[PDB]
Every structure is written in C-alpha cells, then in structure tokens.
Design a protein around this ligand. Structure first.
Ligand SMILES: *[C@@H]1O[C@H](CO)[C@@H](O[C@@H]2O[C@H](CO)[C@@H](O[C@@H]3O[C@H](CO[C@H]4O[C@H](CO)[C@@H](O)[C@H](O[C@H]5O[C@H](CO)[C@@H](O)[C@H](O)[C@@H]5O[C@H]5O[C@H](CO)[C@@H](O)[C@H](O)[C@@H]5O)[C@@H]4O)[C@@H](O)[C@H](O[C@H]4O[C@H](CO)[C@@H](O)[C@H](O)[C@@H]4O[C@H]4O[C@H](CO)[C@@H](O)[C@H](O)[C@@H]4O)[C@@H]3O)[C@H](O)[C@H]2NC(C)=O)[C@H](O)[C@H]1NC(C)=O
Ligand SMILES: Cc1nnn(Cc2cc(C(F)(F)F)ccc2CCC(=O)N2CC3=C(C2)CN(C(=O)c2ncc(S(N)(=O)=O)cc2F)C3)n1
Ligand SMILES: [Ca+2]
Ligand SMILES: [Cl-]
Ligand code: NA
Ligand code: NA
Length: 804
C-alpha cells in the first residue's frame, strides 16, 4: 500500500479502491491501508460530540468533530444535539410517539431507508431488567414492533450470527460455522485475529448488501473498524443520508462491540454492566436526534437487533478432556462453550473417533458436556453439513466450558461471562425491535428465529431475497405494508386410492396373526371406515401434499389414515386424533407378534416379517399405536403390515413410551391432540429428504429402508377450552425429530424407567414443522380456516421447554 495519496474529500468513501492505492473507507484501518491523512481528516475529535450554548451560531472550524454553525444542516454535519441546544427543539425520546401510518420522507427519497443497529451480546432480558437506564431503546420497543426475544442460530457466537442475520442462512450453509475454523479442502484456518478472515472464499450465500447492490439498491458499508468510535459511526451514517439522491444509500448498518465486551469480563448482570447499557442507549438517542434534525425520523425504518445473549461462565466451571482421554495429545480441540474435536495429524491411522466418543460418554455423574457424532446432533441445530464442522462435537451445558488440558485455562481467572451454547438456552436469546413506517405500531409479536430477518429486510427494501432458510411470509405479521404474499407449493404426486385387490394367500411374508374371528350391521360400517368416514376426525388439516415425484397410496381406517409409500414400503405419514376422553388399552396376548397382510397393497410393495427375524439388530414398531385403538375390532387395523416400520429395540423403548403414555398425557393437558407421525431419512445429514439411492442401510436381506429419524407433529386448539377436533381459532403445535439409534448412549440415565429419561430426550429433539417438511418433502396444514401467513408462523414455531 503506497499511502502517499490523500483522503481530502474522500472520507468514508462507499466504493473501495484497489491496492496499492491508499484507502479512506470505514474498513481501511483493519487492512492497515489508510492514507497518511485519514486520522487528521476523517477521525476528527476536536471539541467533543455535543453542541453547547456558546458554540451555537459559531464560525465553521473544519477541525471540529461535529459542527454547531448555522450552515451545518445543509452540509449535513451538525452534532446530533444541535437543534436541541441551539434551536430549542426537544430530544426524540422526550416526544410522545405518534403512529407513522406512511413514510414522511424528504423529496427525492425513492423508498424508506433501512438502518440496522446491531448490538453484540445484547441478552433478551436486558429490555426489561435494564429498562430504567435505556429510555431511547425502550421508546423504540414500545412504540414500534417488538418480540420478547429473538432466537439466534447455533453456535451462539458473534460471526456465525451476524452473517446469518446478513444472509438468512444456517451457518452450515453460509460457511462461518464458528469464530474459529479449519477448512480441510483449502488447508486454511480462519480466526477472529489476522488476515485470512478477509478472504471471500470463507463467506458463502449472498448477504443483504450484495443483494441490494445487485438489484440497484445502494448500500452503506456494514463493517466498521474497531478503532472508529461509535459517535463517528453515527455521524458518518447521518452524513451519507444527506448525500444527493443518486449517491445516497438506502440500507445502512451500525455495530456495537458492547454489551458483549463488558459482559465477558463481568457476567451478564454484573453491576459494571449498567454503564455499557447507558452508552448504547445514548448512541441510539444520537441516531434518532440526528434523524429528526434531517426530518428522517418518520421516514426511516430502524431495526434494533442482537446477535446472541450472554451467560455466567467462570474458569472453575471447566471440564478438561485430560480427565477422560489418555491420548489427549493426538487430538485438536476447538474449545470453549462448545467443543469440536479432530485428529492432530491426519497421518495417525490409529486415531478412531468411536473410541474417543465412548471415552467421553457418561463417565462422570454430573458431566457438564455430551459428545455427539455431528449427524446425531439435534436436527433443530442444523449443524452438520459442512466440511468445516468436525465429525465429533461436544454440546456443553450452559454455564460451563470444555478445554483440552488445565494449562490452556491458566496459560492463555479473567472472564465471568460467555456464550456459544445451544440456541434454545434462555441466556443465549437476544433482541428484536422494528421501528418505522413499514413496521407496525405498538405491536408485540411472538418469538422468532434470526434466520427469518433476511427476507424481511429484503421486503423493507423492495428486494427479491436470494434463496435462504427463512420461510418467507412467516414474519409478515411484523409489517404494516410491503408484505410478501406467498402461495402454497403445488403438489407434485397425487395419491392412489386402492381398494381390496389381493387375497390373503398371495402373501408370503412369514408373518402370522391370531385373527381368524368372524353380520350386515358392522360389515357395511367397517367398509365405510376403509372408504374414509372418520377421515374428517383423523385428518383435521387436509392431507399433506407430497412435493416430489413418487408413488403412494392413501389408506383409510377407523382410527387413522396414512400415505403409504410403495418405494419406501412404509407410510410417509400417519395421521390420527386422540380426544381428551379416549382410553389407553393394552396389546392383547394373542396379538403380541401379529402382523397382517393389507389386502389393498401388493405383496411386492409390502414389508415381510422374515426380514425382521433374520435381522438380529432390527425389530419393528407401529406408527398408529395399537395402544390407542378405539375398539377391539379396530385394533386389528393397527397390526397391518402397512402400519409397520423398522425399529431398533433400544429405540422401541422410547417409541413405546411416547405412544403408550405421552400421547394420552398430551390429549389430557391440551384437550385432544392430532398426531401425524412418520419416518425420516437423512443419511447425508443435509436436513433434506433423501432420495432412494442415498439410503445407506436396509433391514437385512430386503428392500425395507431404515429411517435415521422418526417425527411427530402434535397439534391442538390454542384456545384449549375447545377440543382439537372442533377448533374455531388458531392452532397450537409442538413437534419432534427423534434420532433412530441402536443404543440409548445419549441418555445417561437410560438404564432407569422410561419416565425418568424419555421425555427429556424428546425435549432435546423438539423441532419446527418446517424442519420436518425439509426432511420429508411434505407440506402440512393445507386445509385450514386460517390465513397462510399465520400457518407459516405456526410452521416455524419451536417449543423450547425452557422456563419464562
Ligand atoms: C438452507 O438454504 C440454502 C440455500 O437455499 C440451501 O442450500 C442449497 O441447497 C441446494 C441443494 O442441496 C444446493 O444446490 C446445489 O448447488 C450446487 C452449486 O452450488 C454452488 O452455487 C450456489 C449458487 O450461487 C452457491 O450458493 C454454492 O455455495 C456453496 O458452496 C460454497 C463452497 O464451494 C460455499 O462458499 C457456500 O457456503 C455453499 O456451501 C454450502 O453448500 C454446499 C452445496 O452447494 C455444501 O456442500 C456445503 O457443505 C455448504 O453447506 C455453490 O458455489 C450444484 O452443483 C448442485 O447440483 C448437484 O446436485 C443435483 C441435484 O439436483 C444434481 O442433479 C446435479 O447433477 C449436481 O450433481 C453433480 O455434483 C455432485 C457432487 O459434486 C455429484 O455427485 C453428481 O454426480 C453431479 O456431478 C445443487 O444444485 C445449493 O447450492 C445450496 N446453497 C447454499 C448457499 O448452500 C439449504 O438446503 C437450506 N437448508 C435447509 C435445511 O433447508
Ligand atoms: C460477521 C459479520 N457478518 N456480517 N457482518 C456485517 C454486519 C451485519 C449486520 C447484520 F445484522 F445486518 F447482518 C450488522 C452489522 C454488521 C457489521 C459488523 C461489524 O462491523 N463488525 C462485526 C465485528 C466487528 C465489526 C469486530 N468484531 C469482533 O472483533 C468481535 N469478535 C468476537 C466477539 S465475541 N463476543 O463473539 O467473542 C465480539 C466482537 F466484537 C465482530 N459481520
Ligand atoms: Ca438428506
Ligand atoms: Cl467456535
Ligand atoms: Na430382529
Ligand atoms: Na444410556
């Protein structure tokens, strides 16, 4: 860099110039590339950040940081409080808030600008707990649209989350999977410190500023060099807002290192935390006062958003891999509030991940982390499908750290706070407030995930979003206008409706049943149950649509309905309703090993019992539980070969408990439940439905594919005074994606009775319906009385099982 060029008239230039020409942009300090005069011209500090009575009407001294002269408004370089001190105006916070029904912008403005005020480590509970010291932020919150909290992505670190906010993508898809990373294809590393993080090969997807530029919307630069003070960042944004209509950007970003920086040292609620919250609020006040001076305070949309929260973590709460592993020098550990382990050297052929996992599995009674092969991580975390995420992962308990050896903790107590844990943990939750003409007025919205904002910021700017992991329309309820009006995806495969086409004797399945037991009253009645008379009861929200090319059958029964796949030889889904009044019955002795041919489905597209006998590892279970049959005659339907699915005996303990106990418990507590359950196949852990040829495992000697997971979607009336089957209003849902595993090594207390561990496992693997759609290629809730945007919101809902 030949720094002999100048920054005269180029301060915070929006277009970056190429080396070895010197730079004057808001990033030049980070690349050590600024022109010699950058500090003098662009980082002026003289006389402070606020006008004073004496300075009012002064003679323009260009050296001053901000100006109090009469001409300053037209130059667009006044101090933010100029009109308060020198013209008797009020601070924006002291004004009563008034609905902004339409953009009230200066002439020339083609759209409301968007300003994103991002705050590092701004824990959700600070909005309540620090409300007395943050009046500007509290005005934004209460007069704008706010959520009680926003759910970050895993890992709940700064870079993964800022780039998820920028792109709408899960870290596995955008590539910033941690604050620290190794890419084995590049043979490069990425760190917070240093120069390799500036290379564009690390950064996938399309962040907002590129989406804007590519579509003719001009963007301020989002990144700010750490040395540039906050007051200067604000003044720069206000200066840009004063630019000519053909140069002025439409989207802007501010970033604060606080309260994260203090929160690390002092803990999330340390008494030292009050001051950082005062300064952030003061900065917001400066922005809104500056906007008001420029008559932009009822034109611009302001987003106040955080990347993650902050938890209490100290050095004494550190698990050391040295107290579990003998071989601790043959591994590399990405440490901290999560753990990622790989081999220290790829030439070491004695390195076995299986032995390492086993040595970290349930070894101490209070063990404050749990090891996982990455594909066994809860699917809600979507943290697997990247070569940068190590095969071995440690999910660390909230409040704790994992390190390799004790020397790493005392040769690196200092910190009292940290983050990075599971994104369902309360302490990791962060904030969202939207304020402006396109946002709603004094509106609370439910919690939502940060992956959803990319779309909304595209809507706010009139942009078409790049393909991302948001569900577009699920956050339309934040907006007065500029809503995106989505359509249901078209069904690709239509079902067959097979009647009775096969004789018992055509089947040679090795299956037996004790069912040779014999009337016109109840033969016409059961006929109509196989044509779909109780389908109104058991399929409450329409049949799910299959959104890919396949061959399947709708099978009707008294207690349940299924979409049976001829390719996978099992239901893709099974739907049934259990009212509050329904009764659990036992599986009778004569039917214990009963499997019956389904006369509507060919032998060739059926499973068989012989495969299950020959497979000593694999057993089988049922999607509609026999336990909940409506009558002894109806119970025979639950033993059909078309209701059967492959299950490991270790997983059957879980499934049986869910089906026998929990389904009824949920129907009691929620006033009936509709359950839709089924298999999932994700052998390549991309979070997406596997095609046939991706299946790595079959029931031995057969074409019966083995699920990697089993799902259920449990729906009822949000108004729980109405029964699930007759609900007039909004729905309530919770779902799960249980891993289909041949042991229960994940559950350290699995030797005990299922009532001590099963429900706990299901909670860990809670899921959004949208997760299940991605994984199955199905589309649920097709026929309701509710708006589609409300259904989209419901589909992205996650039941977290955390307290308030
Ligand atoms: C979350 O949202 C995202 C975004 O919508 C979803 O991710 C998408 O999923 C698609 C389906 O899996 C995927 O589509 C593929 O695109 C391939 C081309 O990809 C490049 O171009 C895109 C578009 O600009 C770009 O975004 C991509 O960037 C990825 O890769 C670079 C690294 O080079 C990273 O910088 C970046 O972070 C991103 O990485 C992530 O995605 C890749 C996969 O693309 C993962 O491997 C990484 O781990 C990481 O997660 C790329 O630059 C295209 O080549 C594919 O086509 C193959 O498959 C089709 C199937 O129809 C087949 O018919 C074709 O023949 C073709 O196969 C050929 O190659 C095979 C393998 O080499 C071989 O086996 C065959 O024999 C053939 O030769 C495919 O169309 C799309 O790229 C990603 N997009 C992103 C941004 O990730 C994600 O699904 C959502 N998540 C959930 C849960 O819903
Ligand atoms: C990363 C990343 N991806 N995209 N962006 C730009 C961006 C997007 C938005 C958005 F909200 F709109 F998306 C909104 C704003 C932006 C601009 C982001 C920006 O100016 N910076 C991010 C950052 C800077 C400067 C310096 N950083 C640290 O050194 C740092 N590191 C680790 C931790 S911690 N607490 O985790 O240990 C804390 C830290 F402060 C991170 N930054
Ligand atoms: Ca898959
Ligand atoms: Cl990390
Ligand atoms: Na078996
Ligand atoms: Na166990």
């Amino acid at each position: 860099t030949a720094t002999s060029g100048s920054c005269k008239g180029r301060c915070f230039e929006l277009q970056e110039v190429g080396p070895p020409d010197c730079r004057c942009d808001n990033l030049c300090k980070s690349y050590s590339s600024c022109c010699h005069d950058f500090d003098e011209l662009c980082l002026k500090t003289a006389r402070g950040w606020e006008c004073t009575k004496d300075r009012c009407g002064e003679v323009r001294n260009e050296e001053n940081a901000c100006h109090c002269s009469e001409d300053c408004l037209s130059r667009g370089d006044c101090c933010t409080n100029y009109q308060v001190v020198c013209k008797g105006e009020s601070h924006w916070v002291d004004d009563d808030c008034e609905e902004i029904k339409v953009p009230e912008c200066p002439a020339g403005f083609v759209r409301p600008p968007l300003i994103i005020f991002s705050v590092d480590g701004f824990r959700a509970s600070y909005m309540k707990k620090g409300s007395k010291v943050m009046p500007n932020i509290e005005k934004l919150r209460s007069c704008g649209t706010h959520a009680p909290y926003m759910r970050p992505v895993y890992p709940t670190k700064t870079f993964p989350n800022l780039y998820t906010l920028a792109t709408g993508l899960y870290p596995e898809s955008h590539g910033i999977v941690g604050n620290s990373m190794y890419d084995p294809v590049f043979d490069a590393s990425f760190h917070l410190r240093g120069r390799e993080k500036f290379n564009h090969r690390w950064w996938g997807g399309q962040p907002l500023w590129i989406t804007a530029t590519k579509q003719g919307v001009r963007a301020g630069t989002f990144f700010w060099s750490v040395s540039i003070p906050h007051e200067r960042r604000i003044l720069t944004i206000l200066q840009w807002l004063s630019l000519p209509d053909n140069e002025r950007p439409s989207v802007y970003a501010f970033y604060s290192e606080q309260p994260d920086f203090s929160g690390h040292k002092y803990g999330p609620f340390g008494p030292e935390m009050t001051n950082p919250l005062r300064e952030i609020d003061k900065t917001v006040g400066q922005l809104m006062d500056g906007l008001k001076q420029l008559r932009l305070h009822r034109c611009v949309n302001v987003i106040f958003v955080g990347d993650h929260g902050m938890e209490d973590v100290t050095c004494d709460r550190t698990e050391f891999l040295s107290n579990y592993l003998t071989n601790v020098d043959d591994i590399t550990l990405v440490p901290g509030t999560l753990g990622r382990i790989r081999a220290k050297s790829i030439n070491n052929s004695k390195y076995d991940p299986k032995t390492i996992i086993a040595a970290l599995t349930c070894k101490k009674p209070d063990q404050h982390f749990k090891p996982y092969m990455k594909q066994h991580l809860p699917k809600r975390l979507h943290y697997a499908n990247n070569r940068r995420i190590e095969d071995i992962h440690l999910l660390v308990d909230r409040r704790w750290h994992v390190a390799r050896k004790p020397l790493d903790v005392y040769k690196k107590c200092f910190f009292q706070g940290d983050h990075g844990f599971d994104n369902k943990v309360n302490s990791m939750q962060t904030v969202f407030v939207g304020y402006g003409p396109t946002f709603k007025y004094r509106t609370k919205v439910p919690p939502f995930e940060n992956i959803e904002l990319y779309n909304v910021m595209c809507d706010l700017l009139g942009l078409k979003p790049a393909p991302n992991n948001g569900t577009h329309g699920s956050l339309n309820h934040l907006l007065r206008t500029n809503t995106f009006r989505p359509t249901m995806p078209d069904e690709v495969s239509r079902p067959n409706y097979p009647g009775i086409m096969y004789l018992q004797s055509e089947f040679d399945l090795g299956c037996t049943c004790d069912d040779k037991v014999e009337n016109k009253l109840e033969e016409l009645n059961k006929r109509l149950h196989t044509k779909g008379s109780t389908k109104e009861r058991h399929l409450l929200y329409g049949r799910p649509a299959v959104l890919y090319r396949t061959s399947y059958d709708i099978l009707y029964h008294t207690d349940f309905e299924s979409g049976y796949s001829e390719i996978f030889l099992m239901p893709l889904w099974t739907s049934y309703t259990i009212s509050k009044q329904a009764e659990v019955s036992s599986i009778p002795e004569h039917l214990t090993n009963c499997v019956r041919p389904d006369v509507r489905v060919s032998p060739g597209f059926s499973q068989n019992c012989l495969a299950y006998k020959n497979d000593k590892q694999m057993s089988y279970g049922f999607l509609f539980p026999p336990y909940l049959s409506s009558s002894p005659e109806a119970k025979y339907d639950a033993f059909l070969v078309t209701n059967m699915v492959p299950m490991y005996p270790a997983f059957k303990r879980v499934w049986a408990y869910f089906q026998r106990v929990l389904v009824k418990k949920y129907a009691s507590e929620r006033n009936g439940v509709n359950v839709i359950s089924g298999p999932i196949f994700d052998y390549n852990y991309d979070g997406l439905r596997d095609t046939e040829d991706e299946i790595k495992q079959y029931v031995e000697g057969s074409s019966i594919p083995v699920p990697t997971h089993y799902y259920s979607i449990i729906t009822s009336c949000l108004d729980f005074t109405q029964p699930a089957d007759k609900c007039d209003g909004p729905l309530s849902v919770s779902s799960f994606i249980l891993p289909h595993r041949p042991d229960n090594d994940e559950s350290c207390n699995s030797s005990e009775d299922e009532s001590k561990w099963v429900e706990e496992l299901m909670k860990m693997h809670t899921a959004r319906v949208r997760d299940i759609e991605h994984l199955t290629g199905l589309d649920f809730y097709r026929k309701t009385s509710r708006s589609y945007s409300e259904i989209l919101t419901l589909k992205t809902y996650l039941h977290t099982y955390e307290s308030e």
